[PDB]
Description:
This is part of a larger assembly, with four copies of chain A. By secondary structure, the first copy, chain A, is an all-alpha fold. The first copy, chain A, contains one helix and no strands. The N and C termini of chain A lie far apart (50 Å). Chains in contact: A-B, A-D, B-C, C-D. The interface between C and D is small, with 6 and 6 residues. Chains A, B: It comes from Photorhabdus thracensis. Chains A, B: It is found in: Cytoplasm, Nucleoid. Chains A, B: This is Chromosome partition protein MukB.
Amino acid sequence: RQGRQYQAEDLEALQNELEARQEALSLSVNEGGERRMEMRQELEQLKQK
Amino acid sequence: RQGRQYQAEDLEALQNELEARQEALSLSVNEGGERRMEMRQELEQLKQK
Amino acid sequence: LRQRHTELEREVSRFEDQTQQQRQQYAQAKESLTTLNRLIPQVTLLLDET
Amino acid sequence: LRQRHTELEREVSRFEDQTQQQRQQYAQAKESLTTLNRLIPQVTLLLDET
């Protein structure tokens, strides 16, 4: 499902790798939405103007 | 470390509640950010006025 | 408008306090949940209190 | 300002997409981690491939 055999024989390290990925999730989203959210307000402002 | 003796006999409910509280993390942080930046834009408008 | 600015600064302070408190607290909750789901994600069931 | 609206819509589309994808893939990887540490949180040691 992720990786194709991908060292399943002893996969411990990959979990820690995923933790980094997990972290990059929040960042990658927390920024993203905010940005669009930012422009949303600006967009509204622009519309009002 | 969390709790002092905290239903270690059957703790799954607590993991579920903490997942809910992480959903709350996301909701609250996004709401606070959007509200504060919108009112910062209102501050800017008031400044120009 | 200066009174509005003062109240707006008060509101900025309130939002920042709320955001801090919630983000820290729920981050420590995140750490605790990670410890549970790592060391004992039903490893207690493997133990089963047998 | 309407041209600014057009550019803003472009940016909104780009960020919306990027966030959708990134969150999907990262959530799937997160679910993969959960499946690991749920089905096999070193439960392979109890399996032990005996």
